[PDB]
Design a protein around this nucleic acid. Structure first.
Lengths: 143, 200, 116, 63
RNA sequence: UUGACUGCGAGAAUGACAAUUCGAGCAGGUGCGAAAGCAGGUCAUAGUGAUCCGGUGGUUCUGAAUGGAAGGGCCAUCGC
RNA sequence: ACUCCGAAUACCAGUAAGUACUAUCCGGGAGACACACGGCGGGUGCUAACGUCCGUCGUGGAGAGGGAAACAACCCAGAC
RNA sequence: AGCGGCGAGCGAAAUUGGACUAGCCCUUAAGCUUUACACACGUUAGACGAACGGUCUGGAAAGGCCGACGAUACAGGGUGAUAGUCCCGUAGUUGACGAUGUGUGUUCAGUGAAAUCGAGUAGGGCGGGACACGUGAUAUCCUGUCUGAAUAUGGGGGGACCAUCCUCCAAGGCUAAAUACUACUGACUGACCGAUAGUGAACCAGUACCGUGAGGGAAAGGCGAAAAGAACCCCUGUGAGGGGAGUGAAAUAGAACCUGAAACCGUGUACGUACAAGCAGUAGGAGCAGGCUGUCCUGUGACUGCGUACCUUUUGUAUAAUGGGUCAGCGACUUAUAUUCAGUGGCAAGGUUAACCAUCUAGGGGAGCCGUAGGGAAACCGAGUCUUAACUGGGCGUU
């Protein structure tokens, strides 16, 4: 049977080998064309370079800032609250479920999917729609 | 499913483990990974930089009538570098845990259908003697066989060393290639049940 | 793994060299010249397989014209005659007849004349 | 190595569901002479045209 | 007299792109007219300069223990 | 670089038949951005140049075959 | 996140998963080093070490055929071809007088050590430097220069700065493990090379050789199983070289030595060729010569048609543009990591683990990453959101 195994059709594909004659269709220039910077070894052009016209990444203005809170904040889907083990949905229980990473400080629960258990959400913010769904499944939203 | 144990009654087994369809693309991938896993990847060639010498420009850029050279260790030159000299590689492939188990199940299923999986009630060798094991094998009418027990006795390990195409493996130590490689797979019924839990 | 090219490299060179048997000088001995030679021989052979069909037909037409004019009709008039007589014998056959059976050619010419 | 982000591109081009969002040019100085219409219509952020995207994506490998 | 309005804008023109152009109508507040109306500069088409950095005013969005503040942002605007 | 006039064409749009895998959109990969001659409309030049610069169509480029003695770019014609 | 002619680029931490873990003293410690005394404990020459005959082919048997036999030993090597059983080994079992190393105690003599809890110190000004951080609003650290406290009622830090609060106690020390590396020694391994490769170097190689010197830096492996390396004879200069003879399975294996390609050079034979103009062929084609037996095969090719190499580079090359004397050998899209797209497979609203652990391609390991919601500069809101006083609206999203 070690002589009988074979990959799926489509699974394996021979790599492109430039510069092995005319028949291959990749002879001579190896699909680089004729002359110029781009045909040269190490001749790539930096993405965003536009021939020396003021690039798009400089003719357009910078805008905005990053809040620090954004970096320690995490939205939680209502469907994910399933994964929590126990009734109390808090930052520690979310972290234990790996729903939020351990550096998360602030959580908003959002109406995505459905809650099928009664959970008490303490400490976290909830959307009106999620609150409704929690309360509809016999949950509470503690403060 | 039901497996016909010898020296006992038929053993009920999971149809997921022993009745799975044979996914050849899955088995082929895992088998290939395994073989890549075995590679050592210990080689190297020298590049122009790593070959001895080659600092000085062989002769002046213009005037000599010769083709321009910069180093006697150009890859063009005899005794020169390899343009793309190898260095030691890791040919290991990730296999997903489910993909490994899936392959393993596919293989065991195919063994069953091909009547290569031979379930025995027990398989023990009394002394650490090759000669005894050869006899036992002859009772089972198999010369080339992997012998999977729940735990490998010293005696059976020792009795199998000098035998070619006879390996004694614990359920832990069974591999995708070995199940394929040996002509028959002689499992003790305990080991069957252990393999079942191992593979889901 | 390292691959040495020798054995296969020679086989290619030998194939070409064997095709260049009979050429003058380098063209049968030296791979660089032989290769060029065997390529141009293939090019000529392609061009000539076409042009063979032209050369042979010119020859036939020349022979048919000879024979027709010995029988008192131009090639141009003879072909028209035959066309009008609904005789669909090819130039290759006509020219064969003009050489090997002069009498039959004359018959065909007489038939051709009648049609004109 | 890990691809590095072009921080110039990052500070000017933000990925949304609706595509790469950007601030219009020409709203920094020399505004008196400009029309309130023109200034007003430049104030909303825009989505990059298709031709501008491929590059930006190569400059924002993780965005 | 201050419509050389503020927020917007169906829908188009025109550009590789950046950008450039026209625009009914809606909201708010306004001027002229008895009124229908007209008015978002000028008969129209030139009168111009990206980004960065920085300045001034506003906002009070952010802002690293907390409360402030600095510094960022956003809006208006200035400096080729 | 005048217009009391004013075509053919071309273009835009609609309607309709027949023929055609066409048009469009979103992705992966390019290459190219030295063009040449010929016809036609022109600028430039001397209505010189195998000149030069545009428009448009053809061929060459990347196209063999037949013709034009020989002749990329003309005439005929597209080589499984 | 930040830094950055905010360009090119540079690039953290908080926090979290692991490996390893250990603290101990200036009223004098832990550790370290020495010293001996013990004891353990290992190393250092090694020893024994299973089991095959017959027959066939052959120069030779390890091969074939037939039938045996060992295996805790079928690692590996050698032997006239390819050996579990011929040999050396291997598995396993044993061996150290003495000498070493190690770890424990038990001692010694030191060291730690700066003594005594930290003032020219902290902080400051000026100039620099280091911190991801380019002086920026720039905290912190180091300090060349000039200064200069407080001293637990005190002082340091918490990214300008201030208050509050929290946290720590600088200006004295020592400290294993987890970490880095291997010129050297041993064993073992290889989808590493196999003599233009692999080391520069398989060979008397850092040699020859080159250079005043620093320094540079080669080429060069293979008779045979065994030298059995050719007694003797003959030609020749008591040569070189050869022919016999002999050796050998083989001597076009004879030391200029396995195989023995090509370029290149010869001898012989067939055919052509001394009135004929050029990319040397091609399509056709007589004659001649060999076979086989003339609508065959082979070789040659009078004569006719057609026909200006190749590569490169170009609008365009027979070009009198480039490159190539020829042959053989070698010589150019790789590898690692990350991003993205596609195919394929697994699993599927989930998918997947990383280091590490591990009886080690298993299994553990959930840190993390991607998906599952978007809008907004942002707070924040959220199937919506942003804009605006508010949209009849409009942007993006929803499905």
């Amino acid at each position: 049977r070690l002589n009988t195994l074979a990959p799926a059709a489509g699974a394996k594909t021979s790599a492109k080998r430039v510069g092995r004659g005319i028949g291959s269709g990749l002879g001579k220039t190896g699909g680089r064309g004729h002359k110029g910077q781009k045909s040269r070894s190490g001749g790539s052009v930096r993405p965003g370079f536009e021939g020396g016209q003021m690039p798009l990444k400089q003719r357009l203005p910078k805008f905005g800032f990053t809040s620090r809170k954004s970096l320690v904040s995490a939205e939680v889907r209502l469907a994910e609250l399933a994964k929590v083990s126990g009734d109390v949905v808090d930052l520690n229980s979310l972290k234990a479920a790996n729903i939020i990473t351990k550096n998360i400080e602030f959580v908003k629960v959002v109406l995505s999917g459905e809650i099928n258990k009664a959970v008490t959400v303490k400490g976290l913010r909830v959307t009106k729609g999620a609150k409704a769904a929690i309360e509809a499944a016999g949950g509470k939203i503690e403060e | 499913m039901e497996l016909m144990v010898k020296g006992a009654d038929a053993l009920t087994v999971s149809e997921t483990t022993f009745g799975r369809e044979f996914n050849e693309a899955l088995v082929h991938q895992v088998v290939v990974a395994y073989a890549a896993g075995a590679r050592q990847g210990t080689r190297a060639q020298k590049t122009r930089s790593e070959v001895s010498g080659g600092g000085a420009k062989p002769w002046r850029q213009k005037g000599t009538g010769r083709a321009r050279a910069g180093t006697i260790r150009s890859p063009i030159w005899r005794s020169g570098g390899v343009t793309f000299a190898a260095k030691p590689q890791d040919h290991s492939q990730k296999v997903n845990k489910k993909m490994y188990r899936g392959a393993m199940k596919s293989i065991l299923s195919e063994l069953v259908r091909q009547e290569r999986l031979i379930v025995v009630d027990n398989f023990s060798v009394e002394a650490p003697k090759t000669k005894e094991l050869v006899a036992k094998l002859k009772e089972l009418e198999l010369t080339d066989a992997l012998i999977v027990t729940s735990e490998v006795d010293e005696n059976l390990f020792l009795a199998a060393r000098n035998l070619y195409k006879v390996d004694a493996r614990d359920v832990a130590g069974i591999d995708p290639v070995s199940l394929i490689a040996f002509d028959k797979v002689v499992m003790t019924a305990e080991a069957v049940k252990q393999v079942e839990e191992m593979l889901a | 793994p390292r691959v040495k090219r020798g054995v296969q490299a020679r086989a290619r060179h030998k194939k070409v060299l064997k095709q260049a048997k009979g050429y003058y000088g380098a063209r049968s001995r030296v791979y660089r010249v032989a290769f060029q030679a065997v390529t141009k021989a293939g090019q000529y052979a392609y061009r000539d397989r076409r042009a063979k069909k032209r050369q042979f037909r010119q020859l036939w037409i020349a022979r048919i014209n000879a024979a027709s004019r010995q029988n008192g009709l131009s090639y141009s008039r003879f072909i028209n005659g035959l066309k009008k007589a609904s005789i669909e014998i090819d130039r290759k056959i006509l020219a064969d007849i003009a050489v090997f059976d002069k009498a039959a050619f004359a018959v065909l010419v007489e038939k051709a004349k009648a049609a004109l | 190595p890990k691809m590095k982000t072009n921080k110039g591109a990052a500070k000017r081009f933000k990925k949304t569901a609706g595509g790469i969002k950007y601030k219009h040019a020409t709203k920094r100085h020399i505004l008196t002479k400009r029309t309130t219409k023109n200034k007003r219509q430049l104030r909303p952020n825009a989505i990059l045209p298709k031709c501008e995207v491929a590059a930006v994506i190569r400059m924002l490998p993780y965005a």
